[PDB]
Protein: Surface glycoprotein
Organism: Severe acute respiratory syndrome coronavirus 2
Amino acid sequence: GVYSSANNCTFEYVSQPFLKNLREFVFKNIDGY
Amino acid sequence: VYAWNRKRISNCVADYSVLYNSASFSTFKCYGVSPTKLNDLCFTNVYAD
């Protein structure tokens, strides 16, 4: 029910996946990027 | 025409010269910018109505 009411999409993307095991991630949002 | 369809065009390389040189199109004039030079500009989205 999270993916419900998909309205006004402006971008879409699908890619190859990733992954006692640690996954580290950094999310930044600078200059519209 | 009342239920006119819309496609969003986003995040792709927009080849344009293939549209010009097809020459199967009756009405193709362009407003806002010259036709052969709008192959060289970048946009956030393009609406295909």
Observations:
- The CA atoms of residues 13 and 42 of chain B lie 10 Å apart.
- The first strand of chain B starts at residue 7 and ends at 9.
- The first helix of chain B runs from residue 17 to 20.
